[PDB]
Design a protein around this nucleic acid. Structure first.
Ligand code: K
Ligand code: K
Ligand code: K
Ligand code: K
Ligand code: K
Ligand code: MG
Lengths: 31, 306, 90, 112, 75, 116, 119
RNA sequence: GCCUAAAAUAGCUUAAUGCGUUGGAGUAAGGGUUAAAUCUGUAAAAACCUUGCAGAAAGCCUUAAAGUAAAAGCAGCUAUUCAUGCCCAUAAAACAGUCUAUAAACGAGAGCUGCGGUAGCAAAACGGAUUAGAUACCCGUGUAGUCCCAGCCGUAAAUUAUUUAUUAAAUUAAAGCGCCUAGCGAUAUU
């Protein structure tokens, strides 16, 4: 795998982690 | 701090984790005395006495200690905190018993003086003493758990308990479950000792102490699951100050906490000091709990007056 | 030219007690010399290093030169002279 | 001073030796009945017996030391190897297979 | 602990000996290591760079030595 | 009066140089530093500041009667060269130079590297 | 196996040193071993001083003992050294079982037979 | 018989560092930056000679790893338990294989629960600077964590595909598998 391929995946992983933390402390999870 | 994960795990040995069959058993955690080898029967007949409950009432018949009374029958044990009687005679431990009046464990020791009958006594059980062990006191005894020696024959770093303030009155300082004290240095006629609360104090070198700790390491893991569990021990409920009426408590009014928190008699209870500034015992205290020097406490309002 | 001990001598005298013998493999500052300087086999290199480390634990050697123990050289020579005289008389 | 022969015997004996050496000495003596001749140490009867004895001695060892994972993995490897050896003997030489099972008190569960 | 005696007031000579002791007995190396912390994976890379520089210097002077041996160059 | 043998301790740790004069038992008699002479935050790292501090210490040492001294150096730095030379040229005789720089056998974790 | 004990004790009198040595010897004998060598080197000056909480010892008395005993003797000897307060530092090291290897013995046997065969 | 940077278990050593540490001596700074300041001191600090207490880590040897520990990984000293590796001398008449559908065990660092410990370092946090802004990089303090014991979690840019023959490698031909079929796009459902 190349550096370019790593960077393309990096952005999507960051977005998923951010959303999960927001729903960590909510009654109704946003999905 | 109790958490429900701790009870679910059911890891620590020596505890009884009651299954949540009923609402009053869900959070209940107790001590398993059988698994530890602790006797939980009746005390020795010649070292015990039955007494009535006082329920916090003095000779005038008025309540002086609140929230007491209404428990089970009370029986008291006689404990020999000073082993000066049996200095030379060795003792053999017969049993380790539980006493509902204290948080530690008591040990029953039999002595056999030459030319006399056996003698029975109660002693505060050290951390690692079991039935059949041999306990010794006085000069010529090893520095091991369960031995009582004067402070002049104890190493600095050895933990100790049941320390005497006065030369022969008896041990008074370190008694609670799983507590100990250490010696930092020894001067001409005094030793610097750190107490369980973190206070540095001067104690005469001719006082005696016991090597080791106290014999209950499961005290802080207990959880009473019911109100009635502490009723059986002899404790009564108490009412919050802000729940009462104005004629009963300073917090009585309809509003909650109109004034800073205080006792039922109006004394601030969130930091105001109660020890006497000019107490005679200031000459023996070097550092108070938290690290405050004695001079800072003794001379604090005198500077403000000046 | 400097003295060199034979590999047979090393295997027979490589012990933590023989501080004098072990000194030949230490630098003037008191550190262990590498194998490329001692000219020893790998098994012999390990034995010498372990002997020195064990001697340090027993206070028979110091990890480095010490300023407060500079009189030992005088002491060792004085002890050596007495021992030689005693054995010669005997 | 006189010589102490009783001291020499103790030193040359198994008294002053590690535990493993003493155990291994007993294992060899226990196979004196099934070996082919006085010096047989490699016949299938001897090899299987020695592996079985090692397993029995290792059971108490790992009940106390439950964290020595390296030793357990070695034991597991030998455990599987012995099964395949017995599987081969049964298919090709039943009479030898029968003797090993009878001597060691095993069960006939090594078929395919 | 290195002790350098001063003879005839030649302080500069004593200073030269002190520098030699530090380099020979590995005092400068200890100071360099303790200036700041590096992970074992980063320390490995640092050691490679230092060895690479040493090898380049050895190669350069190997070329010069051959010229001197053959052509008897007075450098 | 002037027949006094002393010790001069030089500490240099990449930011400042500290010179202390002591007797042979370890009791301090005088001490100097670049900031005590007039050189401040950024100017304390110059070789001129080290020389001035060394000269001032020598003047006090001679007044007290210390003419023969031994120099103990701790640390690796460039200021030690100038301080030692100034002491010799100021009239103080130097008999020995001793290096006592410590060396941990393992030790504590240093701080992280600056990502400047 | 064969073990060797090196002990550094305080420079006290002979009676105190003898008592410390006797304790180790009886421990070996009780377990079922025997002692081969007993030696003393007197008071020696160390490379650096041994420090106790309030004491400094620049010298010590050194003696050595060699004994053969079961593998359980090491813990017993270690306990005795810790309990005794006249001992400053100690170490126990294991030694080879035999002086001569099997190969060396065979060569001697062969040489003897050759002499007999020639005779 | 010896050896071991192998694993588990138990004892022991201290170079340096820290302090609401002891005594002596001495007086204005110490610390830090591109340049400064916050911060620590003058009510007696740093520096120097001494005293006490404490945790972590293992200079030279020391080098790859050449041990390969199965992989993750592994060098302060000594001993026990156990498993390897070396020499020298033996042993087997019939038995022992490769690969893995399925199943199981081991498994860095971070993280979670309880118990003990807390020097140094350091997420978060709070101040001083830099800058158009600095919510970052730099400086000063500094809690979890890093450490010990018992559990949970099973994730890495967590090594070169495995085996036979040939071969320094390579190349050539086979045996049993897993995975890929343009990219892009889910916290889909189970
Ligand atoms: K209430
Ligand atoms: K009110
Ligand atoms: K992990
Ligand atoms: K990774
Ligand atoms: K493809
Ligand atoms: Mg009401």
């Amino acid at each position: 795998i190349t550096t370019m391929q790593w960077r393309k995946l990096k952005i999507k992983k960051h977005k998923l982690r951010k959303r999960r933390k927001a729903n960590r402390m909510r009654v109704v999870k946003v999905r | 701090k109790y958490t429900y994960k701790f009870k679910q795990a059911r890891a620590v040995p020596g505890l009884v984790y009651w299954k949540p069959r009923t609402p009053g058993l869900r959070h209940k955690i107790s001590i398993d005395y059988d698994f530890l080898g602790v006797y939980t029967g009746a005390p020795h007949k010649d070292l015990s006495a039955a007494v009535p409950k006082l329920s916090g009432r003095n000779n005038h018949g008025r309540i002086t200690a609140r929230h007491r009374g209404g428990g089970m029958k009370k029986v008291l044990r006689q404990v020999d905190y000073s082993r000066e009687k049996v200095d030379g005679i060795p003792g053999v431990v017969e049993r380790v018993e539980k006493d509902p009046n204290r948080s530690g464990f008591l040990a029953l020791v039999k002595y056999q003086p030459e030319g006399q009958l056996p003698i029975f006594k109660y002693h505060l059980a050290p951390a690692e003493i079991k039935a059949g062990d041999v306990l010794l006191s006085g000069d010529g005894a090893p520095v091991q758990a369960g031995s009582t020696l004067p402070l002049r024959s104890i190493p600095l770093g050895t933990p100790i308990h049941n320390l005497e303030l006065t030369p022969g009155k008896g041990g008074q300082l370190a008694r609670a479950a799983n507590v100990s004290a250490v010696i930092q240095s020894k001067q001409l006629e005094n030793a610097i000792v750190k107490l369980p609360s973190g206070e540095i104090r001067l104690i005469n070198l001719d006082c005696r102490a016991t090597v080791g700790r106290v014999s209950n390491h499961l005290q802080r893991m207990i959880n009473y699951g019911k109100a009635g569990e502490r009723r059986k021990l002899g404790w009564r409920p108490s009412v919050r100050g802000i729940a009462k009426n104005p004629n009963d408590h300073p917090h009585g009014g309809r509003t909650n906490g109109g004034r800073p928190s205080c006792t039922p008699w109006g004394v601030y209870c969130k930091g105001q000091r109660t020890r006497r500034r000019n107490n005679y015992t200031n000459k023996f205290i070097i550092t108070r709990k938290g690290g405050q020097p004695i001079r800072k406490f003794a001379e604090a309002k005198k500077l403000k007056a000046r | 030219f400097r003295p060199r001990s034979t590999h047979q001598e090393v295997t027979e005298m490589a012990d933590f007690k023989n501080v004098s013998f072990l000194t030949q493999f230490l630098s003037p500052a008191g550190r262990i010399q590498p194998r490329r300087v001692t000219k020893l086999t790998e098994p012999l290199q390990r034995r010498i290093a372990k002997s020195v480390k064990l001697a340090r634990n027993m206070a028979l050697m110091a990890g480095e030169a010490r300023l407060d123990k500079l009189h030992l050289t005088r002491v060792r020579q004085e002890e050596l002279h007495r021992y030689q005289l005693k054995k010669s008389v005997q | 001073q006189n010589a102490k022969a009783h001291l020499v015997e103790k030193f040359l004996g198994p008294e002053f030796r590690p535990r493993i050496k003493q155990l291994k000495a007993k294992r060899l003596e226990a196979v004196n009945d099934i070996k082919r001749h006085e010096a047989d140490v490699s016949s299938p009867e001897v090899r299987v017996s020695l592996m079985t004895y090692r397993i029995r001695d290792s059971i108490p060892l790992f009940d106390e030391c439950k964290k020595e994972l390296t030793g357990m993995r070695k034991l597991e490897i030998m455990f599987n190897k012995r099964r395949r050896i017995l599987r081969g003997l049964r298919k090709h030489n039943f009479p030898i297979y029968s003797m090993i099972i009878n001597k060691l008190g095993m069960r006939d569960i090594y078929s395919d | 602990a290195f002790v350098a005696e001063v003879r005839d007031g030649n302080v500069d000579a004593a200073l030269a000996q002190v520098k030699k002791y530090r380099k020979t007995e590995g005092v400068n190396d200890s100071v360099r290591k303790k200036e700041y912390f590096l992970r074992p994976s980063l320390q490995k890379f640092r050691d490679s760079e230092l060895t690479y520089a040493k090898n380049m210097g050895k190669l350069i002077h190997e070329r010069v030595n051959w010229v001197v041996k053959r052509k008897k160059i007075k450098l | 009066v002037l027949q006094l043998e002393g010790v001069v301790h030089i500490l240099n740790t990449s930011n400042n140089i500290v010179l202390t004069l002591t007797d042979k038992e370890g009791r301090v008699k005088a001490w100097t530093t670049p900031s005590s002479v007039g050189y401040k935050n950024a100017k304390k790292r110059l070789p001129v500041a080290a020389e001035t501090a060394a000269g001032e210490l020598a003047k006090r040492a001679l007044a007290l009667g210390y003419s023969t001294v031994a120099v103990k150096i701790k640390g690796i730095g460039t200021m030690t060269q100038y301080a030692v030379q100034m002491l010799s040229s100021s009239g103080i005789k130097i008999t020995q130079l001793v290096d006592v720089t410590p060396v941990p056998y393992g030790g504590c974790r240093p701080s992280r590297k600056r990502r400047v | 196996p064969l073990y060797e004990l090196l002990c550094l004790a305080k420079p006290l009198g002979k009676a105190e040193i003898a008592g410390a040595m006797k304790i180790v010897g009886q421990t070996v004998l009780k377990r079922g071993g025997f002692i081969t060598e007993v030696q003393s080197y007197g008071e020696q000056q160390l490379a650096y001083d041994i420090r106790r909480p309030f004491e400094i010892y620049p010298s010590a008395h050194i003696f050595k003992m060699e004994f053969a005993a079961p593998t359980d003797i090491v813990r017993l000897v270690t306990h005795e050294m810790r309990v005794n307060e006249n001992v400053l530092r100690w170490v126990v090291v294991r030694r080879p079982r035999f002086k001569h290897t099997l190969q060396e013995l065979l060569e001697e046997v062969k040489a003897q037979e050759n002499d007999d065969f020639k005779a």
